[PDB]
């Protein structure tokens, strides 16, 4: 039910599998097959990615007003690169 995503700087993010599987890339990387290492994505980026999964799963198929997903300017470039690689 939970999987571990490890950042370049060694941070270990434990998220529900269904949340992780909103990345196609991660879905493929799971096929310690419940652990995945990201030697190119630092913790300040991977933490945001995980927040995005929570966000996506909460608000996908919701009639409630949906809030903006916030992204600080300082991480935008890296988050872009990570999002692109992760396909999410």
């Amino acid at each position: 039910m939970y999987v571990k995503l490890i950042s370049s700087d060694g941070h270990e993010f434990i998220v529900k599998r269904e949340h992780a599987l909103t990345s196609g890339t991660i879905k493929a990387m799971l096929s310690e097959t419940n652990e995945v290492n990201f030697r190119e994505i630092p913790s300040h980026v991977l933490s945001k990615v995980c927040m995005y999964f929570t966000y996506k799963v909460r608000y996908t198929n919701s009639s409630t007003e949906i809030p903006e997903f916030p992204i600080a300017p300082e991480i935008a470039l890296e988050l872009l690169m990570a999002a692109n690689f992760l396909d999410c």
């Binding site: 966000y55 608000y59 949906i66 997903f69 935008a76 999410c88």
Partner: protein
């Protein structure tokens, strides 16, 4: 042209509620299928609108043209009337697209080329959201 308003001449009253943090640009598809811009709604605001049954509307960020939803879908079609509600909301953008929006909003288009990013991301940045494109997309899906 496949995506067009029907010329019904049947009045239908509608409320456009901007339940988004963006300045909303309402867009009416005319009888030829040409997008027609109407007045902008600032964030949080509403307008009572006289339209007609079978008319097609969609909604976009007025500054960046990012796609918005309306009653959780792409197109709004006034039905028979009580005013009908058109709740305009953010979609759940992909993280990639949201990142693009933020980067676009922070960098002048002539400086995209000076970002230390792979070529294919320059191009992804340059490929701004575009109504006529979205309409070609939607037309082919039929």
């Amino acid at each position: 042209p496949v995506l067009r308003s029907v010329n019904s001449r049947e009045p239908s009253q509608v409320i456009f509620c901007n339940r988004s943090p963006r300045v909303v640009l309402p867009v009416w598809l005319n009888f030829d299928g040409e997008p027609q811009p109407y007045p902008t709604l600032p964030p949080g605001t509403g307008r009572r609108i006289h339209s007609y049954r079978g008319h097609l509307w969609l909604f976009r960020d007025a500054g960046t043209h990012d796609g918005l939803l309306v009653n959780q879908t792409e197109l709004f079609v006034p039905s028979l009337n009580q005013p009908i509600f058109a709740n305009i909301t953010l979609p759940v953008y992909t993280l990639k697209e949201r990142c693009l929006q933020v980067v676009r909003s922070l960098v002048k288009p002539e400086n995209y080329r000076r970002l230390d990013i792979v070529r294919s991301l320059y191009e992804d940045l340059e490929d701004h959201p575009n109504v006529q494109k979205d309409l070609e997309r939607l037309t082919q899906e039929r």
